[PDB]
Design a protein around this ligand. Structure first.
Ligand SMILES: *OP(=O)(O)O[C@@H]1[C@H](O)[C@@H](COP(=O)(O)OP(=O)(O)OC[C@H]2O[C@@H](N3C=CCC(C(N)=O)=C3)[C@H](O)[C@@H]2O)O[C@H]1n1cnc2c(N)ncnc21
Ligand SMILES: *OP(=O)(O)O[C@@H]1[C@H](O)[C@@H](COP(=O)(O)OP(=O)(O)OC[C@H]2O[C@@H](N3C=CCC(C(N)=O)=C3)[C@H](O)[C@@H]2O)O[C@H]1n1cnc2c(N)ncnc21
Ligand SMILES: O=C(O)C[C@H]1CCN(c2ccc(C(=O)N[C@@H]3[C@@H]4C[C@@H]5C[C@H]3C[C@@](O)(C5)C4)c(SC3CCCCC3)n2)C1
Ligand SMILES: O=C(O)C[C@H]1CCN(c2ccc(C(=O)N[C@@H]3[C@@H]4C[C@@H]5C[C@H]3C[C@@](O)(C5)C4)c(SC3CCCCC3)n2)C1
Lengths: 376, 376
């Protein structure tokens, strides 16, 4: 009999990540877990038909059930307005959900031994989160802020303390959850971030970090980058300042929005819908899309659900699926992007990787085997 | 007979870098070059005695003679106010000179084959410059900028176009001088930097870069860092945003303030006075201070002087001194910081490095040999 999963808020996406989403739901989750799934179709067509209301409804559902799992959606531009005949250029769903829930988005890459990383010395995962908004910029033609005194360009921003307290609480809750030490990086206004972090830490998180064998320290980003390059990793990085690019493969990058209460979490893939692979999929050409980010979104969601419900079966299942993914990649079975991470894209042959459906089938067989091995 | 050097503005410093400054002047420069040296003693005692006027006078002298060579000075704090009984906590001389002259400071590390760098893939020098100021920050107790609308913390900044044009001109003049491609990194207000750089480039620097076999491109800093880590180097990096730390040894780091006109240049060591080594020097203990940054400040100053005067002898001499330094370090003779860069500080023995005066004597012998080898 399947595990009793619980209440999970599902958010369906677009294009290739939508295909991968249904594949993961049918091959890795539903055959073994029975969920109270609150499905919200965040497709661009459904978003346009409901005037982007389904995104608000889904965010409220995450606020109610404390667990959300999101697929990659389309942030529309003008070309997207033409492609789907949209009634408007809708806002980013991630920004709407992040604004309704609050908290902080944390990104982490999945580590495999045979997949080279940006720095060889890195051994343990490095989780990175940034302070979101939730600032006025105008141009001065020719020759104050209230009252202080400030052609060219003038911009003035205001940041409430509530956002600093939410960022601090989210960082501390994340560090307590993962069990890694927390480091804050900054660069007069920045003098308040350090004092608020230190006060909330000393008053509400000192004995918790001490019991968790972790700690919190403050750094300058100039020191944080250099020290991070010459370290083994294994830490949470709260970055200040005011997607990704080329720091590894995007199929291994995962994202988790964490609310300051420490109970509401949204997991999703850090990459996008992977549009090019979807264009090759529509014409019927062979694709090789990496499903690790979405799978780990599901396993992070089920993991936090198990933590909230104290469901040991669900936690063991999510951890088991993560282990199946990492072990499958380490055994030599991977998509084309990882083989390109190993041998380099020019030297990549067809025998060096599996396509999308072959890799999903491999993960299905290996997950079935590992779950069958749990016979005590 | 000595070379006719020309007019050079000298700025004497403090403590260990002052000792090294006199050593370099007596061992590597004066025996071979006859300079119209406009010496300005920027010592903390002389700065305090003249109410920091000697810094202004020196900066004006650099503005007149287009060439400046500066030693490391002391930026005083409270402890420095007590140490020298200062009449005031004087401002940074580098900021005063940089404000009087304008331009942009560019930092570059000296490369040696046996001295490991932060990334193994780096082969060619990476020069990095930032946009200086030359912004109001206040606290809001409880519940606009003119007129646009903006407890907490509020800050408002204003940046004229003249600073953007000076930063652009200085970056283009630097890229033309060194012969490396220029890359600008940014992150609404930032939309003007790109347009000003592109306009000044297309109207005043296109055929110059084309003739110099270089080019200019715009990047996002998120892409600039990742792409820079997976490149061989050899470029100028104009960084926007709004000393060093641990990106190598500070004894190999050099700084050059470049005015937008492309004719006025100030060279100095990127590191500070190295106070600890001076404390070991006062007690009579053996020290091992790296003189490469100050030597390369002198050779950069003499190099720009030779370029302004079309003095081929002076340029050949400065380049010869740089070659003597790099070749001497590559031959196995170095200070303790470089030996620590090789074998690691715990595994560093006394036989792995030379002290300060031994290294200066070695550079004297090798420079004498190379200059004697120039017998055609
Ligand atoms: O072919 P190759 O592997 O070189 O290139 C692929 C892929 O094309 C590229 C990035 O694709 P991407 O979807 O990550 O980003 P992009 O296509 O520019 O944006 C497309 C689409 O995604 C929406 N986003 C963006 C970010 C997150 C997000 C969300 N809702 O959470 C939505 C944008 O709005 C836009 O409409 O890199 C290669 N790539 C990326 N990921 C890959 C995987 N998993 N497997 C293989 N290659 C992958
Ligand atoms: O002993 P070890 O090699 O580990 O440490 C030395 C040195 O102590 C340390 C940095 O010394 P520093 O002078 O670079 O920076 P610091 O001592 O913190 O500041 C001292 C003094 O310098 C003035 N500055 C600062 C920056 C530039 C500057 C200027 N006017 O241009 C002035 C400050 O105001 C302050 O009063 O790192 C090691 N180190 C640095 N440089 C070394 C060399 N050349 N050789 C060997 N070790 C060196
Ligand atoms: O030539 C050498 O071998 C030594 C040089 C090479 C690199 N270097 C410095 C010297 C100084 C710096 C440096 O100051 N980095 C800062 C920049 C870039 C980012 C990190 C820091 C804060 C920030 O706000 C963002 C501004 C750097 S940044 C480095 C570039 C390469 C990729 C990682 C980030 N690099 C000194
Ligand atoms: O776990 C892995 O193997 C993949 C992770 C590890 C590193 N990583 C990312 C993923 C994303 C980023 C990243 O977004 N870097 C930006 C930060 C830090 C600085 C560079 C960029 C602009 C900036 O303003 C300054 C803000 C980074 S920064 C990197 C950290 C390590 C030293 C060099 C600079 N790193 C993805």
């Amino acid at each position: 009999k399947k595990i009793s999963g619980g209440s999970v808020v599902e958010m369906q996406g677009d294009e290739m990540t939508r295909i991968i989403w249904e594949l993961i739901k049918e091959k890795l989750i539903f055959p073994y877990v029975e969920l109270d799934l609150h499905s919200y179709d965040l497709g661009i067509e459904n978003r346009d038909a409901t005037n982007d209301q389904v995104t608000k409804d889904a965010a409220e559902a995450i606020k109610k059930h404390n667990v959300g799992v999101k697929c990659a959606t389309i942030t529309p531009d003008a070309a997207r307005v033409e492609e789907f005949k949209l009634k408007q250029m809708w806002k980013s769903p991630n920004g709407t959900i992040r604004n309704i829930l609050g908290g902080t988005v944390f990104r982490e890459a999945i580590i495999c031994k045979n997949i080279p990383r940006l720095v060889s010395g890195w051994v343990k995962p490095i989780i990175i989160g940034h302070h979101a908004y939730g600032a006025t910029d105008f141009v001065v033609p020719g020759p104050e802020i209230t009252t202080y005194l400030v052609g060219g360009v003038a911009m003035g921003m205001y940041n409430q303390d509530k956002s600093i307290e939410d960022f601090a609480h989210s960082s501390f809750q994340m560090a307590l959850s993962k069990g890694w030490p927390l480091y804050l990086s900054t660069k007069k206004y920045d003098g308040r971030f350090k004092d608020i972090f230190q006060e909330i830490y000393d008053k509400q998180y000192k004995s918790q970090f001490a019991a968790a064998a972790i700690w919190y320290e403050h750094r300058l980003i100039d020191d944080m980058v250099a020290q991070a390059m010459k370290s083994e990793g294994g830490f949470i990085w709260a970055c200040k300042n005011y997607v990704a690019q080329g720091y590894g493969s995007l199929g291994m990058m995962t994202s988790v929005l964490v609310c300051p209460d420490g109970k509401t979490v949204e997991a999703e893939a850090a990459h996008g819908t992977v549009t090019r692979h979807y264009r090759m999929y529509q014409k019927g050409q062979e694709t090789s899309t990496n499903p690790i980010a979405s799978i780990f979104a599901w396993t992070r969601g089920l993991a936090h659900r198990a933590k909230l419900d104290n469901n040991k079966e669900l936690a063991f299942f999510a951890n088991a699926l993560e282990e199946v993914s990492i072990e499958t990649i380490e055994a030599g079975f991977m998509t084309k992007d990882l083989a390109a991470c190993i041998k380099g894209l020019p030297n990549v042959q067809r025998s060096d990787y599996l396509n999308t459906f072959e890799f999903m089938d491999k993960l299905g067989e290996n997950l079935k085997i590992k779950l069958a091995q749990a016979k005590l």
